Write a protein that binds this ligand. Structure first.
Ligand code: AMP
Ligand code: AMP
Ligand code: NA
Ligand code: NA
Lengths: 460, 450
């Protein structure tokens, strides 16, 4: 330490080192103007497209599948999301379209970039697939684990790529109201603006794990970091072409958790919407009890309750969305799964639910939540976090108009629910009215609350 | 052969099983201490638990009159002293899963057997077999010392007391002669708060990694002893978080962990134990009723009921595959009267042949224990080898082939062998623990071959 450190002058936990895994991908955008659309359409027989639209492909295996679903979307002006389930089509998309922009996406990747922007002591990101195109989208300051002659090093992630690695690219096709094109001998005028999304959902990128080269060194990484933020389990498949299943990968994920926890690393998992109820339940069973902190949104309280057998409550949260029921559902999830702290983020309020013996005071818990929503507000206002001073931009965003109402409903809920086994803290969010960016804000909230949580634990 | 070259840690439950012989004089002197009208009144009230000497006398006299076997919990630790002053014990022996397993492994003279229980009064320590060790910390340094001398004076004493009574015995309740109509046992189980705080206590906790370095496997049991709530604000969850920390410390040291599961009546607590422990360990040993109890709180109510009711091998296989699919530990062992089973993942290193030999070692070892009353030395194993496989072996085998025909076997490895059932066993306590000990020991040995 330099010793120029001043208590009065310096809320961002600068001294922390954090590991993030497993999910990072490319988010690419294509602007569909008139020439782009017509040239795409022209490549195909119009009758063949029309027949395919009638067949209505629910996933993309061939170029015609994509063209039929996109044209259908454009004619109705209705946004849609269609999975790409064929890795070989990456080359087709890339030869066919020019990308307006390419950004990092995925929870681990977006959280890594935010923390490097905050200039904390060390940020190390891990993804099993790191082609050069992805590695280059990480911010300066992000590290990646490398084995250099049976010894563990951390290298700049931009230099650590493997060519040949599968490329997870999610593509957003933007269209505008009013554009016209011809399908054979029929003029189509797009009735409104929207987006058509093609998500990467082929096999190679669903093998989510620490690969066998880095695995023996996870303990040595654990010695370097104060915290680990894990996500990406939602990308797993229930069955694989080589006879593996989601369970196979979850046993490897539990091995990873054991290596970090034994080294006294606190682990946060950022939960996600999980489509497949069967996979959702496996992630909840295999992962959540064995970690420290879990970050969810409001919709996810009901989805987790449901798989744990609390069907009445899940229905009620879904039907009415009462704050009292969200606090009860958080309490039950914490009681059932018995990790250390739950954080829930919603449009108008953030919440922590902890065990009665958590070391932090309710004031510390509030400040950690405040730091999460303030960091999101900054990121929403600026687009990207570039230095620790950017946090102050977030401080200028007021707590939202519903703040009084949230606090009143919170006091009412306390009077109605059994509080004794828990600490519960609810704070209003700082909502940016006209944000420059909205993707990934929940991950930003979770990263910021978890980082400050770690720092507060160091004073107990 | 006997695997010899293995070191095993076992925790957390050990207790005393003590027997009292209720002869006419013991019964009459006991009763004589009390107002017979007050005894009758307490019997009318019918206490479900023992908090005071009159609760015990009341329930006991009521079972003696009916000749009815019964079990009533002791919920008052302060009454240990009363029992011990009032009665002479015909016999005291070690019980509890981790105690019985420790004594079995020490009898096999494996390389090292370390037991841990957080409550070790001198009376308990003395009932461990020669060779059982206990972790002891002196000036910040860990040693493994004979458990018999590692006791702490004043530790809580978990003693289960079995009162044996005989048909024909007569006694007087006031002026009424009571003659006992059937022989039987009245059991008083230790169910007070201090012995439900199941954990590694803070003096040894920091050293679990250093134990991990010394052992090849760990067998954990006794989670069924936890309570939902404690008088100092703790709850089952507090002890379950500590239990997960212990598991992490051994797994990082590459120790395989077996959990010997048990009946838990409270379904909500049962589910907490399953949630917090079973997905985190390697091997899990259960019997037929436990398959149904687990299935029940996972939401397979209809399957669980078929198992409780009918005991069909086909439903036990299906139930077993469901449990391994849901919980995703490494290997499931199921012990039942007529057969033992393993269910694993398709990528388990062991061959079906080694899986079957591991199960055969489990049942053989139980057969030896059942024949002899104990495992005294490694050669006792040979006594089990002379107990034939049971008469239902052919039937089990047919039912097994029929089950695989009807069930989606995926590529799970499922191995079913018949038990060696002893005709007139001298002992029937701890047999399931003994199977699980032998099957797990051999599993670890076979894992070394890959
Ligand atoms: N405009 C905004 N300003 C600040 N925070 C926001 C904004 N929009 C969303 N968030 C936060 O991000 C969380 C997740 O957002 P979403 O990805 O829309 O579900 C929400 O629950 C809010 O807590
Ligand atoms: N007479 C016997 N000889 C050998 N093994 C036995 C005998 N009786 C029961 N077992 C085994 O011991 C296990 C424990 O069952 P229990 O006797 O109900 O506690 C059973 O599943 C059988 O596999
Ligand atoms: Na950022
Ligand atoms: Na979000």
């Amino acid at each position: 330490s330099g010793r120029e450190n001043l208590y009065f002058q310096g809320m961002i936990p600068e001294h922390l080192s954090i590991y993030t895994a497993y999910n990072a991908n490319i988010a690419a955008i294509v602007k569909l103007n008139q020439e782009t659309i017509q040239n795409l359409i022209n490549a195909f027989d119009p009758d063949e497209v029309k027949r395919r639209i009638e067949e209505y492909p629910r996933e993309i295996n061939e170029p015609i599948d994509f063209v039929a679903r996109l044209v259908h979307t454009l004619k109705l002006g209705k946004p849609a999301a269609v999975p790409l389930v064929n890795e070989k089509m990456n080359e087709w998309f890339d030869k066919t379209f020019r990308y307006e922009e390419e950004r990092l996406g995925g929870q681990a990747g977006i959280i890594a970039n935010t923390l490097a922007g905050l200039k904390i002591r060390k940020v190390i990101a891990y993804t099993p697939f790191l082609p050069k195109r992805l590695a280059e989208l990480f911010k300066k300051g992000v590290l990646y684990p490398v084995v250099e002659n049976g010894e563990l090093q951390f290298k700049p992630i931009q230099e650590a790529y493997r060519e040949g690695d599968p490329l997870k690219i999610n593509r957003i096709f933007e269209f505008r109201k009013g554009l016209k094109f011809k399908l054979g001998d029929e003029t189509i005028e797009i009735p409104n603006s929207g987006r058509f999304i093609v998500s990467a959902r082929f096999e190679s990128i669903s093998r989510i794990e620490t690969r066998e080269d880095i695995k023996p060194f996870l303990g040595e990484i654990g010695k370097e970091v104060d915290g680990a933020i894990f996500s990406g389990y939602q990308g797993l498949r229930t069955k694989y072409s080589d006879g593996k299943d989601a369970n196979y990968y979850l046993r490897r994920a539990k091995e990873d958790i054991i290596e970090f926890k034994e080294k006294d690393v606190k682990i946060h998992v950022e939960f996600a919407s999980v489509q497949d109820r069967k996979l959702r339940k496996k992630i909840i069973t295999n992962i959540l009890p064995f970690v420290d902190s879990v970050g969810i949104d409001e919709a996810e309280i009901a989805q987790i309750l449901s798989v744990l057998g609390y069907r009445e409550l899940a229905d009620r949260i879904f039907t009415y969305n009462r704050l009292e029921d969200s606090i009860l559902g958080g309490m039950i999830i914490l009681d059932e799964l018995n990790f250390e702290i739950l954080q829930v983020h919603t449009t108008y309020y953030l919440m922590y639910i902890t065990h009665r013996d958590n070391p932090l005071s309710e004031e510390e818990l509030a400040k950690s939540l405040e730091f999460g929503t303030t960091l999101a507000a900054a990121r929403a206002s600026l687009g990207d976090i570039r230095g620790p001073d950017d946090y102050k931009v977030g401080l200028k965003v007021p707590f939202n108009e519903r703040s009084e109402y949230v606090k009143l409903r919170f006091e009412e809920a306390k009077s109605r629910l059994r509080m004794r086994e828990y600490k519960v803290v609810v704070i209003p969010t700082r909502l940016v009215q006209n944000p420059v960016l909205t993707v990934g804000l929940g991950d930003t909230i979770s990263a910021g609350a978890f980082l400050t949580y770690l720092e507060f634990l160091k004073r107990h």
